[PDB]
Design a protein around this nucleic acid. Structure first.
Lengths: 93, 136, 116, 56, 78
RNA sequence: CUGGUGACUAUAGCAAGGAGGUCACACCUGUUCCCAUGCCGAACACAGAAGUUAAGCUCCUUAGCGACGAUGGUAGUCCAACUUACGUUCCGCUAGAGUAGAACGUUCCAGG
RNA sequence: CUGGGGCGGUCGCCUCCUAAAAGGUAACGGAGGCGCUCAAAGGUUCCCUCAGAAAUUCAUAGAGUGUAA
RNA sequence: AUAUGUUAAGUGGAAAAGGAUGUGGCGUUGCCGUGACACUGCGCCGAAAAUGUACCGGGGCUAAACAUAUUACCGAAGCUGUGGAUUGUCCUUUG
RNA sequence: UUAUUGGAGGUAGAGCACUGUUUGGACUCAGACAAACUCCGAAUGCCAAUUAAUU
């Protein structure tokens, strides 16, 4: 149900995101009306496992601060050359 | 084969080739597609050859889309001429295929039939390609 | 309907680029309605007004209501402006043809001590 | 003062703009050093030639 | 196998001539141009050949006129 | 809240619905006079029995079209170093989404 | 002048692109034009708003600007 | 030299499309020890020239190779130690 | 020379709002190309202040 997500605080230097994307973690943002801009870290293995069950445009469960606020996926990045996810914009409902 | 009915200027520069594909990376029109992983100039000759191969294999049962087009004309000179005395004369028409771009799309056949068709088409093109399907 | 007052403001904008845009000021801006006529002395370095006079500020005596009322309005504005010490004016006609009522508001203010 | 600056690399093969900044810092020959009060303006000069100079 | 091209004009040194916030005298040219890429503000006049010159001496400043348009103005020092 | 006149990057609009009357603004009524139509009192301009909110006009509600618009990410790049396209530091778009948003506003004259 | 010389083309001026967001910037690099015209196609003052699609409506400008851009 | 892995071709110490049960890693599924694949690191075939080995400088090495990270040393007319010569500028001492 | 501030300019990028090239649908929807296309748009370089800290 609830998924842990460590928050990435401050400026993420390019080598930080580069050597993180070579390890299995993807940045992401969660916002809406009430909660705004918690730049957090999301795992690539569990996210695909939840998207295989709920779908691409469904409601994806995720713990924003160790709590579920029924966040919905708005858009996501993807590079066609490696089959690796890049970023998610997590609109809070 | 393929070329513009009219261009405004008959003699252009050569197009840049370093970089990555800017648009057209996703299988939009059909079900399966062939994706490029190396920069090159794709002439209209090998486009029209790869299309013949891919369609003759499927026995013209499925549908095929060509996601690229030769827009830019390139020029060449006479055999023994020395350097100088103006530009060349138009020779052919090219497309620039950088890594990422989806070249051909196929729809209306099984997975293995399309995989064999897009294998036999990718032996007539000067780039290295891989088989992708519609982004789930 | 061409909305007569809207086609007046285009003409006024075209009037008011060489008039208190690079030229002498204050302006004596007039405004013409179906019945009355209004005028005010304006300066545009700040954007404030210095006088007022109308065809409805108790100037009525039931004369030929359109031209003579313009004359009385002009006399009133000319006696106001010379009070505060303003003997200089550029005349912005507001986009009305300088004829009849606006012409009378103007040429009845020159004779009352306010020299264009 | 603070910020002891020492030239470590030569300025042969470096663009002229980098050489001008080293002269402004007061550094002269290789292995020479200077002492300067810390400013936001002196920090910028050291950053431009940070590879050439060593600061303590 | 000759060429038919090969003639070009001679480059008119156009563009701005006085930076912003600078002091200028009573006749200095501020901007060369064809047409009006930039309009005259206040204390700035436009020549018959499109060009912007200062009428008085003061600080020069580039403002924005409406949207997608800009102007230049000269203001009195002190 | 009504009127005149200025400043402002459509957060200032277009479109769709509702309300308002002769104290103001217009429609109107008609060419005696000023003036006018390259034909035509349609406009311009001259004077005004009487009547209407129909349209103009001002105001109220709409997020359909426009305009505005973050954070995160990406592309691109000054610098450096390896060496042939990366790898470290800085700046950092476009597009797209979350959103403001059905304007604020000076000075005068009036019912107040 | 000249990717050796000759034969071919060019030689002065204006406008774009190459040109790397100031200005300048080359090649026998890529495209065009000039060697005038107007007594109103000049000055000043008033008034007016176009192409095109179905006298009316739509229209923001897709017209026109003597002559290339 | 120290620590942990890679490979076996003498790669290292030239070259492409394309071909392959070579070997290391991570991941992900389908039938209960076997199959499928995804992305990867290092290789191997493709690979034929003229006086003489002859595409490491030589010997020679599968570690004296490659990747990762530390600790020493060698190394220039650079820099510094000592002595001296010329030109300057300061005046701590016209020194 | 750096750092603080202001300014002119349209290239890399991207985009289809004009000009041209272009693919597949319905009867306008998706998707692409541009040195001489731009509704947009850097990093830097440039011009200054009569500004400071070094030299």
């Amino acid at each position: 149900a609830s998924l842990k997500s460590i928050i990435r605080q401050g400026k993420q230097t390019r080598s930080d995101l580069k050597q993180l994307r070579k390890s299995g973690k993807v940045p992401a943002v969660v916002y809406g009306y009430g909660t705004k801009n918690v730049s957090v870290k999301v795992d690539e293995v569990e996210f695909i496992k939840v998207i295989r069950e709920v779908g691409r445009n469904g409601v994806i469960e995720l713990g924003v601060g160790s709590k579920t606020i029924k966040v919905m996926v708005a858009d996501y990045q993807f590079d066609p050359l490696k089959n690796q996810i890049t970023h998610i914009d997590f609109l809070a409902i | 084969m393929l070329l513009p009915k009219r261009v405004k200027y008959r003699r252009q520069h050569r197009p840049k080739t370093t970089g990555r594909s800017k648009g057209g990376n996703y299988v939009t029109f059909g079900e399966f597609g062939l994706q490029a992983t190396t920069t090159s100039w794709i002439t209209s000759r090998q486009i029209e050859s790869a299309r013949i191969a891919m369609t003759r294999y499927m026995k013209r049962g499925g549908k095929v889309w060509i996601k690229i087009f030769p827009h830019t004309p390139y020029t060449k000179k006479p055999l023994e001429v020395r350097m100088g005395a103006g530009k060349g004369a138009v020779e052919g028409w090219i497309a620039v295929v950088k890594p990422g771009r989806i070249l051909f799309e196929v729809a209306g056949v099984s997975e293995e039939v399309a995989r064999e068709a897009l294998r036999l088409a990718s032996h007539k093109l000067p780039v290295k390609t891989k088989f992708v399907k519609r982004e789930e | 309907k061409i909305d007569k007052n809207k086609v007046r403001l285009k003409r006024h904008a075209r009037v008011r680029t060489n008039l208190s845009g690079t030229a002498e000021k204050p302006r004596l801006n007039v405004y013409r309605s179906n019945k009355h006529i209004y005028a005010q002395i304006i300066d545009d370095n700040k954007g404030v007004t210095l006088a007022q006079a109308s065809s409805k500020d108790s100037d009525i005596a039931t004369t030929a209501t359109k031209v003579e009322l313009a004359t009385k309005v002009g006399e009133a504005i000319a006696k106001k402006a010379a009070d505060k010490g303003i003997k200089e004016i550029v005349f912005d006609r507001g986009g009305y043809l300088y004829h009849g009522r606006v012409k009378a508001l103007a040429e009845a203010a020159r004779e009352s001590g306010l020299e264009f | 003062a603070k910020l002891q600056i020492t030239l470590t690399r030569s300025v042969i093969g470096r663009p002229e703009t980098q050489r001008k900044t080293v002269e402004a810092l007061g550094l002269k020959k290789t292995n020479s050093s200077v002492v300067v009060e810390d400013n936001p303006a002196i920090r910028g000069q050291i950053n431009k030639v940070k590879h050439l100079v060593t600061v303590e | 196998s000759s060429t038919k091209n090969g003639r070009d004009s001679e480059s008119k040194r156009l563009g701005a001539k006085r930076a912003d916030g600078q002091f200028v005298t009573g006749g200095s040219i501020l901007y060369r141009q064809r047409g009006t890429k930039i309009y005259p503000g206040e204390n700035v006049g436009r020549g018959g050949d499109d060009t912007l010159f200062a009428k008085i001496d003061g600080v020069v400043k580039f403002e924005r006129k409406g949207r997608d348009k800009k102007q230049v103005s000269v203001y009195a020092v002190a």
